[PDB]
């Protein structure tokens, strides 16, 4: 997350860190039930001789704040039983960039581990709405990942504006969220993590960190997979 600040402990208890064997933190994910995470499909593609598609290769850290304190009180580690990429995920276009991760053993809910609510198909996140991106991604393009969970407030950008900012790259599955002036954005290593929307008091997940043209550049807000589109798919596949 570029331009963010340290999260408070327990502030984003649905935020999950996914480590690939021998590599540490690679992507984020969100807890939606005791047994299921939402993440981005592009993170679980085989690459550079490593089987990122094999669920046995991953460890999920729940209730994590600081990557250098993985054994801290309230942190839970879980193996994955499986990865369900969206059947329409496309790694040429990044369309349908969403996956479901089944935990091998359930998460125990605590003060530092709680689920985020899924928005119904009809739930609208209007343009202009302030929402939050969080993660352990790079704090500058070409930089290095944050040890402490970062948060940044960003705004939903109108789809037409978004399409025009990134011509021929934006599908109806995607949403731009950020600022035209840049400054605050997701970045590498934030992929898969949640956009968290405060509605009321209820928190819903608005999207999933997917990609962008660099990070925090003027006129290049991050792109996110939209979540209401996938409500039924999520229910059919997980029962959540």
């Amino acid at each position, epitope marked *: 997350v570029v331009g963010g600040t340290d999260a408070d402990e327990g502030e984003w208890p649905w935020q999950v860190s996914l480590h690939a064997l021998g590599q540490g933190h690679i992507c984020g994910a969100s807890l939606i039930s005791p047994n299921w995470l939402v993440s981005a499909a*592009h993170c679980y*593609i*085989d*690459d*550079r*001789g490593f089987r990122y598609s094999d669920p046995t290769q991953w460890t999920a850290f729940l209730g994590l704040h600081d990557q250098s304190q993985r054994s801290a009180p309230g942190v839970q580690e879980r193996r994955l039983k499986r990865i369900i990429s969206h059947p329409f*995920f*496309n*790694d*040429f*276009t*990044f*369309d349908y960039d969403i996956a479901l991760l089944e935990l091998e053993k359930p998460a125990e809910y605590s003060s530092m581990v709680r689920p985020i609510s899924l928005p119904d198909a009809s739930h609208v996140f209007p343009a202009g709405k302030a929402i939050w991106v969080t993660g352990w991604g790079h704090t500058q*393009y070409g930089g290095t990942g944050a040890l402490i969970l970062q948060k940044g407030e960003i705004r939903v950008i109108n789809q037409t504006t978004c399409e*025009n900012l*990134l*011509p*021929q*790259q*934006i*599908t109806p599955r995607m949403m731009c969220v950020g600022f035209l002036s840049g400054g605050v954005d997701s*970045c*590498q290593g934030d*992929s898969g993590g949640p956009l968290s929307s405060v509605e009321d008091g209820r928190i819903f997940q608005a999207g999933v960190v997917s*990609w*962008g*043209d*660099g*990070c925090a550049q003027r006129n290049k807000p991050g792109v996110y997979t939209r979540l209401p589109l996938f409500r039924d798919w999520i229910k059919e596949n997980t029962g959540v």
Partner: antibody
Amino acid sequence: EVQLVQSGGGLVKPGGSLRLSCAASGFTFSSYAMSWVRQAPGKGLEWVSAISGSGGSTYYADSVKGRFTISRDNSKNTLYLQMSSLRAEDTAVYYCVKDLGIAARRFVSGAFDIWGQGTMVTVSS
Amino acid sequence: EIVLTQSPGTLSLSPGERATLSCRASQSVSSSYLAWYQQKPGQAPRLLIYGASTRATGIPARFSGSGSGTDFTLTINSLEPEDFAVYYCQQRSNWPPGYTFGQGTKVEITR
């Protein structure tokens, strides 16, 4: 050290089939989308077909759709083009190309930064 | 889908002159997705400029690219006799997916 070495091609009869190969080295083949681009004698460049890094997604120019199949073998770092139902109009030098884009690292591009040496295919009776 | 129209068709300049070559897109193209190639006769095209303005590895500084939206320019600043070539512009689209090329500007060398 970064290279695409092509093989296959030559003379083929109309309605026949031919497979082109492209051996990749010096880069992480699996991380990049790859294409074939051809050039008929005295004409410009024509993109023929693309395949994503993983091989999961393929696209074709209208001119070749239904007749050509692009594939890749990431364990062998090789790109293929199976051509079939060949026509006179498919006569061209065929190049394999590596795409510079890598959205997984938030670097977006449409550029073909590495080109194979080209293989001439002539469709004739 | 996206049509790239290159102008002029042919250009003849003396060494040491500046060549300005235009690529006009039928619809907006993100600078990131616009590139230029040089093709000398009897050779594979080679990448010159990617992302509208970024010079590729080993390409001499006299080659510069600029522009945005629908108007892109390749500038060769102090043309050398070896710059005789066809220069092509090219875009990638993800939605709808595709790649297209302009039809080239042939640069010839006056003497």
